[PDB]
């Protein structure tokens, strides 16, 4: 097949976006069984496929979010007797995003992967603004390290799966059903399955290694055959299934 193939254009699954590699390079990667791979697509099924707003809500629950985006304003603060970092939260935006967050959730995120800071260093004034206090560096660096901290915390994750990049709601139109379904990229299946709302027992990953790591090798054996047949036909070459079953 690798010789007769045309490898035609316009493969976007009907959403004019999020194309993937096909043909010779894809097969060259399926068979190498590399435990790491690009384009780590994951599919998932909703609890109700017509609940559009709830679909968006679970999307928000699963998508990665950062302190530097949930806030429209951040500032370093210097006072003659104190120094501290300030953040102003985007309240109306959070309502609009339907994000299930609260100011203090940042505090819980704080003291994780941030080197000796304590929750008491954070002054949660209220729903609008929260702030954090520095500490004596005491070695290898000076107190004015504030600058490094001030530009670093905005990067910290506050809500969502760390390993996900983005998720897209796919819609269909056929007479059987005009409904929605959720498509996600990111190389960790176990996380997406472990949430409310998602019909986890139907979730499917394109990369072999993850499904093997989570569902066992007998599920890997089936994902190979699905994947090879999927790529062959989505080109349009006919290979008898018994010829691929042996390979798996």
């Amino acid at each position: 097949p690798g010789t007769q193939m045309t490898l035609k254009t316009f493969h976007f699954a009907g959403v004019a976006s999020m194309n993937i590699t096909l043909g010779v390079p894809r097969i060259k990667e399926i068979i190498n069984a590399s435990k790491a791979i690009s384009t780590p697509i994951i599919t998932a099924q909703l609890d109700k496929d017509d609940d559009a707003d709830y679909a968006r809500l679970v999307k928000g629950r699963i998508e990665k979010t950062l302190l530097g985006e949930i806030s429209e304003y951040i500032e370093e603060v210097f006072l003659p007797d104190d120094c501290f970092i300030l953040v102003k939260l985007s309240l109306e935006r959070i309502r609009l995003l339907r994000l299930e967050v609260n100011a203090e959730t940042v505090r819980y995120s704080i003291c994780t992967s941030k080197l000796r800071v304590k929750p008491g260093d954070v002054a949660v004034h209220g729903e609008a603004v929260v702030c954090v206090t520095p500490r004596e560096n005491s070695k290898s660096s000076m107190y004015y390290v504030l600058q490094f901290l001030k530009e670093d915390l905005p990067k910290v994750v506050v809500q969502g799966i760390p390993e996900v990049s983005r998720a897209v709601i796919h819609i269909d139109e056929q007479s059987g059903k005009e409904k929605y379904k959720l498509l996600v990229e990111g190389d960790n299946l176990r996380a997406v399955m472990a949430t409310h709302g998602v019909k986890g027992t139907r979730t499917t990953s394109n990369n072999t290694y993850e499904v093997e790591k989570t569902l066992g090798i007998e599920a890997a054996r089936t994902t190979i055959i699905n994947e090879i047949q999927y790529t062959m036909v989505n080109h349009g070459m006919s290979i008898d299934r018994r010829h691929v079953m042996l390979l798996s």
Partner: protein
């Protein structure tokens, strides 16, 4: 992208209806038509280029990129987006192409012609790596599939 999808959409419609407004006027006993009906040689989409209109010459599935600063050639204004300035060729092979159209069309020809050798570069080593791991399996008289051991 929204704009460009509309552009390629309209241009494709131009070719679809141009071929449509050609296939019905051809006589029976016309030769390209006969050889394309029975299917031995050619295709309808091919007759349309050879008579009616050659299409948008996409490079790797996109409109021809801008080579110079914000334009494909000097012969067109900077930041211009009109169809002719990004690959569309309005002539058929019967009226004959014009300098810019000829240059863009030969660019799309060379893109493919580079491929034929290259797409054999990986094929050979799948053909090798596979058979070198899998040529030993054979089917026994008890209907099982067994390796050498």
């Amino acid at each position: 992208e929204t704009l460009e999808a509309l552009i390629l959409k309209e241009l494709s419609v131009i070719r679809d209806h141009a071929g449509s407004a050609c296939l019905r006027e051809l006589d029976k006993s016309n030769s390209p038509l006969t050889m394309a009906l029975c299917g031995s040689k050619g295709s309808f989409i091919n007759i349309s280029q050879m008579i009616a209109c050659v299409g948008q010459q996409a490079i790797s599935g996109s409109r021809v990129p801008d080579g110079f600063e914000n334009r494909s050639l000097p012969h067109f204004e900077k930041h211009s987006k009109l169809p002719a300035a990004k690959g569309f060729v309005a002539n058929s092979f019967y009226s004959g192409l014009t300098p810019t159209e000829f240059f863009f069309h030969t660019m799309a020809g060379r893109e493919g012609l580079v491929d034929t050798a290259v797409k054999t570069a990986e094929t050979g080593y799948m053909q090798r790596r596979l058979v070198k791991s899998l040529e030993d399996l054979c089917s026994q008289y008890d209907l099982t599939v067994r390796s050498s051991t």
